[PDB]
Every structure is written in structure tokens, then in C-alpha cells.
Amino acid sequence: HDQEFDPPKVYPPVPAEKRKPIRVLSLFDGIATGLLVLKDLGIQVDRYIASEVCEDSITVGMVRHQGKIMYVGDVRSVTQKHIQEWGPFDLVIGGSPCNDLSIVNPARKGLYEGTGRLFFEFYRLLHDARPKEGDDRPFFWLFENVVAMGVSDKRDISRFLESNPVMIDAKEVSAAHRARYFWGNLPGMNRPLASTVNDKLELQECLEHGRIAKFSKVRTDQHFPVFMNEKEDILWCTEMERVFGFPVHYTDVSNMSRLARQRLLGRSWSVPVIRHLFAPLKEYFACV
DNA sequence: TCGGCCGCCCTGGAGAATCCCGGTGCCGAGGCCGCTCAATTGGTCGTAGACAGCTCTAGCACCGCTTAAACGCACGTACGCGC
């Protein structure tokens, strides 16, 4: 599909003597997957600012990052003054809530409802955190969304962000079936999925003991995908974290139920997919 | 992908009812006394029934035919039973 045409801006590599840690703005953070991947790659983080509403996700971040995260409330409360007073950013990330962007809803409300239009909030903060002309600072940005969108919606998003959406499927690097569009200007945006041997490709490596995988991988019949003691059992939450690439026992931070952990892990990013995406940032920024 | 209502399980605390415990009155049961009439004793007959014997009726026992009816098997559908 060639509807628009624009070259991706490739920044020159900075040497090690002018190497600086990253300043990261994370708009729709949720479960703090971005800072988790950044800490796993061994990258020094000078400032991480997450604008999260949901208190369970804020609790996930406060437990798993120990007060490193600077919290904002709603993204509508962020102005241009808040962007220009919190220093210039080096990495902007986010994925808008796809309640009305997904075409799996028969009665979907579209891009221009209060769940979808938050994307434009992103664009506004994309417009504020972007450096002006004449500044050769390497500025990188990343937007995530689902594959189940309309043609006009994806076309308008691609025109607004001015980048080619690469499609990445979790089955090439992890044990999940979800294809996601990624807008951004990272180097090697469409390079193939370098599967890490430490990543759990099959489903059975993500299971616990005493459980047999019925399928080869899981999706995002009135049965259950795991047999347990010759009985079909629901897929566990820690096993869901191992499928989604998270560390073991990650989203157990408060007194939330099983349904809350499902709602948090469903909306979260895939750790291996991000690790692939954030990989070339290591040569552009600080290392630890 | 979303949270707005909606039935389930558990548990907690009001809440009416009931059990338990004394406190006081009350009236009917236990006990004592006269007496009176029926229980008892002694004695006498009369006959109802215990007992021996004889009889003779039918009740049990056995066998042989004879079919009348019970037992078993398949089957199907109509009512029992659950929802």
C-alpha cells in the first residue's frame, strides 16, 4: 500500500565522548513496559515521565521501578509549558487505547471519540517535545496500535505522524498471536525479527510445572488452551507475563483481582517486540 | 475493547423469639381421721369341668395325569419424573 511517500529521517551516530543518558516521555504507559525494556537493555535513564491515569498501572510502576517514574495524571492536563519546563526529551513513546479504534467492535465509535482522540493528544505532545529547526539532537518517537483498524483510520494516522507503519507480529519472537502497527523513526524500523535465544518462542517454555500446552501459541471452541492434570484450565497470569515477555511475577503489585491483571496485561506492550525496537538506541545513547 | 448492572458466596450485625433463672403467690395434691359397708373366713351343697375311653371324620400324605397358568424374553410406547 503506497498512498503516501516520505523518506525516514536518519540521524547521524554520536560518538562515545558526547554520549548522554536518555530522557523519556511515555504518554500512555500503563504497565511500564518501556522503562522495563530500557533497564533490561542496560541504558542509563536520566528522566522518565509517565502520564498515566489508572491507579493500578501507577502501582505497577511504583513497585517495579522504585520512584524513578515521574507521574503525571491525565494527558489532557499536560500543556506546552509542562513539556518545555521538564527538559528536552530524547524518546517519546505511547500506544493509544483501542476501545474505538479496533474494528472488532460492531458498534465502534471511531477515531474521533474520547478513547481514540487521545491519539491527537499524543500528536500535540509530539508537537511540543519535537525540537525546532537547526537542532541536530537525535529525537526519536514511537506510536503503537492494533492491526484491526480501518483503511481510512490507518491512512489518517500515517499521514498525521508522517511515517510508515511497520507491522510486527508477536509470534515471530514470542508465544503470542498479535500483530501491531508501529509508527516511528527508529533506525532499522523494518529490519527482520532477530529472535533471541533467551526469549521464549514456544508456549510450553512459558508454562509452569504440571501443565501441557494444547496449542503452539496463544491468541490475544468452549475449551481452554492448557491441560492441567488431564483437565482444561485457564491460562495463568504469570504464564501470561511469560508469554508477553515480562519478568516472572511482574504484575502482582497490589490487591487486584484476576480480571484486573487481565485488563492490565492485555493492553500492555510485548517486551521482546519492544526490545527489538529499542535495540539500536544502545549505540546512540548511554550504556550501563 | 469498556465499565454498568446483576446474580452468588460469605459474613456481620440488628432483631424477634426462646431458653434459663430466680421471685412470689396460689390452690390442688398429699396426708390424717371417722365410719361404714363390703372383703374376708368358715361352712355347705351342686354341678361344671377334669379325666378315661371309644369312635369315626376328615386331615395329611402320596401318586398319576392334565392342561391352567406362571416364568422368561423382546419390544415399544405411555406415563413417571425432572425442569
Ligand SMILES: Nc1ncnc2c1ncn2[C@@H]1O[C@H](CSCC[C@H](N)C(=O)O)[C@@H](O)[C@H]1O
Ligand atoms: N486519557 C488518558 N491519559 C493517559 N492514560 C490513559 C488515559 N486514558 C486511559 N489511559 C490509560 O492509559 C493506557 C492506554 S491503553 C494501551 C497501553 C499501552 N499499549 C502499554 O504499553 O501498556 C490504559 O491502561 C488506560 O488505563
